[PDB]
Amino acid sequence: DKEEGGDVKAVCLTLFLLALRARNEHRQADELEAIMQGRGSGLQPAVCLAIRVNTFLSCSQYHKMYRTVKAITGRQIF
DNA sequence: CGGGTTTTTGTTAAGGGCTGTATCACTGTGTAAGACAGGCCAGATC
Numbered sequence: 582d583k584e585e586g587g588d589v590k591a592v593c594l595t596l597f598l599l600a601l602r603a604r605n606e607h608r609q610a611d612e613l614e615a616i617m618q619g620r621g622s623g624l625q626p627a628v629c630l631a632i633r634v635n636t637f638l639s640c641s642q643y644h645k646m647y648r649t650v651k652a653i654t655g656r657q658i659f
Numbered sequence: 660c661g662g663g664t665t666t667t668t669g670t671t672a673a674g675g676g677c678t679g680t681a682t683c684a685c686t687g688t689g690t691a692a693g694a695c696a697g698g699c700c701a702g703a704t705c
Binding site: 607608 | 675676677678
């Protein structure tokens with residue numbers, strides 16, 4: 582209220598980001614500042630196809646990996 | 660157009676820790692048959 586005027590949201594988020602970066606946690610803080618926007622980090626089907634082909638993966642193994650990721654993370658990345 | 664004041668950056672006096680890249684000695688794909696010149700026995704022969 583003194584400096585910002587009531588902007589508790591931004592100052593607390595930035596303080597937490599700095600508290601995260603102080604302990605060498607760039608990964609979690611980057612994930613946090615990415616989810617702050619509220620957009621789904623998805624991949625195009627062409628990208629998944631290229632990954633599947635250029636890494637010597639059968640359709641069965643790719644399906645297993647897809648199922649595992651979607652069931653653990655609870656969201657679609659591939 | 661400057662003083663005076665503010666904001667948002669540089670900055671190495673030295674260490675901790677995560678991330679990316681070079682390095683090393685090797686690997687798998689080149690993979691079955693045909694041409695030919697010399698030797699030798701059965702044989703038509705003059």
